[PDB]
Design a protein around this ligand. Structure first.
Ligand SMILES: *CC(=O)N(c1ccc(-c2ccns2)cc1)[C@@H](C(=O)NC1CCC(F)(F)CC1)c1cnccn1
Ligand SMILES: *CC(=O)N(c1ccc(-c2ccns2)cc1)[C@@H](C(=O)NC1CCC(F)(F)CC1)c1cnccn1
Lengths: 305, 305
């Protein structure tokens, strides 16, 4: 029993974290085989940030200008290139702790674990959702850039995020491991605000299913609804449209609890219209939307890696 | 910026997790040097549970009856003994991934990371507080027993908890790594309910300081209070007494924000008496008490390991 915001075991990612320094600036790198991936703004100074010419700046850097450290051991850089907003530093030593891995670009609404690092040393692990507005609500201080987000399926680590910058609203923007930003954000000190966010409706439904499984059932009403009628209410409360794909992905939770998805939609509709009246669901006083249907399944079936 | 419920990197603990099987029952073991620590109820069957005679049951077990697996590799047991509610299985191979470690008994109100495991394989990491009633609100399914709780200071892993059982209220009970239970709980299927819990006042104050640091300042009132007057209000709302020790441990957060501890107490007093009026603090609609003053400091200073 019990439901908790749960991260993946970070051990396989800990073994890939290195420190990258180019002159003044130091941040985190991801070491897989004989390549170190890091944000390209490592080559920017405190005076380049408004609109840095990354091509020009990189040209003036040698392999020897890049100080890469795996603990107290320096890795010799023998090649460097830029792919979008990330640098790829070729080193003469392959990471002996290189796990089975993939580079994926996740969808908005999907969740991943972040290993927060400073100077190539991991500080903590936490679970994030890619927001519909293509930001993440993380915990990142100065020198956190190059920290990665990931999912694990048995033995394979799927890297989906590398941290680049914070927006003035204190939310976070980054790239896939091909260095393409999530959302319209750019790696420079410019005027860029996140679009208005929305609640991940399918995730709220998943979390309500988690509540029932854990015996927190107070909110279940005697009603049903059409998908169309639910989505008209959802729209009013800034919830994203629930699609048949969403209904289908909720099937295992519906099968386990015996509650039809449109019946759970009816209970959610009432919670949105009437509020929670000072009550809690799984120890929360508001509706939680950063648990995917698979997150709920994993935590309620005990899938290991 | 940002504040998140953050676990320690689990890598050092992942390398210590093994599977222990004695006949019918399989659970998790902690492998340090040439000793495997696990709950003693591994030697109980489904018919022994009401009041198992652990001494009698253990006597009838051989070294060879204990099947210990580190992945797919069997560890040969060459000795076994019982210390309180844990077994110590001596194996012929020392764990090559044995980190620098200690066994501590934590105080109520203190926090630690849990590495949830099944069949010696880690599923997830999450942050817990030892409740004043000596339970933890974790996420544990069948076969989770032997999963450990820990803190990390630079290189040293301090093991403070091993999971044993769930209470009918869905809260969790376990032991230190000397096998002494936290609280009055026993490893058998008996009538044992957790005493009434209380809110960890010093932790709520720490979390309010975290909010101010992150720029969530709406709740700060223009008032102060005596420690004595605060504790009379706190008592009414089932908050534990705030001691001078608690005030002293909050000093760094008071120094950083410029808010005197008794001034923060005045703002907390108003929140308790008037509620939050539908508003949130660090994205929560109720007052959070599972962040220690040091947890807030670590996450707001970026301490690595
Ligand atoms: C890398 C890092 O941790 N941070 C950072 C992001 C972006 C840049 C850029 C340089 C060129 N284009 S954008 C540099 C550094 C920090 C961060 O924003 N730190 C600032 C501190 C003040 C300053 F020095 F003036 C400018 C950098 C970061 C990232 N994520 C969260 C919080 N801080
Ligand atoms: C080890 C484990 O995961 N669990 C467990 C706890 C305690 C015992 C005891 C045996 C003798 N004294 S107490 C055995 C197993 C489970 C758990 O309680 N599983 C039960 C399932 C039904 C049953 F088989 F009839 C009896 C065991 C556990 C632990 N923590 C959370 C959830 N489940």
């Amino acid at each position: 029993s019990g439901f908790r915001k749960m991260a993946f075991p970070s051990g396989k990612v800990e073994g890939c974290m290195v420190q990258v320094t180019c002159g003044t600036t130091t941040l985190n790198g991801l070491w897989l085989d004989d390549v170190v991936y890091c944000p390209r703004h490592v080559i920017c100074t405190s005076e380049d940030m408004l609109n840095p010419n990354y091509e020009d700046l990189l040209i003036r850097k040698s392999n020897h200008n890049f100080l890469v450290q795996a603990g107290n051991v320096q890795l010799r850089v023998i090649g460097h290139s830029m792919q979008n907003c990330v640098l790829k530093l070729k080193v003469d030593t392959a990471n002996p702790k290189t796990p089975k891995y993939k580079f994926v670009r996740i969808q908005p609404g999907q969740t991943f674990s972040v290993l927060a690092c400073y100077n190539g040393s991991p500080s903590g692990v936490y679970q994030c959702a890619m927001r519909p507005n293509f930001t993440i609500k993380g915990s990142f201080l100065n020198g956190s850039c190059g920290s990665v987000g990931f999912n694990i399926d048995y033995d394979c680590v799927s890297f989906c995020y590398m941290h680049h910058m914070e927006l003035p609203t204190g939310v976070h923007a980054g790239t896939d491991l091909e260095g393409n930003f999530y959302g319209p954000f750019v790696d420079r000190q410019t005027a860029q605000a996140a679009g208005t966010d929305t609640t991940i409706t399918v995730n709220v439904l998943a979390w309500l299913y988690a509540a029932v499984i854990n015996g927190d059932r107070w909110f279940l009403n005697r009603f049903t609804t059409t998908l169309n009628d639910f989505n008209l209410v959802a729209m009013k409360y800034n919830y994203e449209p629930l699609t048949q794909d969403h209904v289908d992905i909720l099937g295992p939770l519906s099968a386990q609890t015996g509650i039809a998805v449109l019946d759970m939609c009816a209970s959610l509709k009432e919670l949105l219209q009437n509020g929670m009246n000072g009550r809690t669901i799984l120890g929360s006083a508001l509706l939680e939307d950063e648990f995917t249907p698979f997150d709920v399944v994993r935590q309620c079936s005990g899938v290991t890696f």
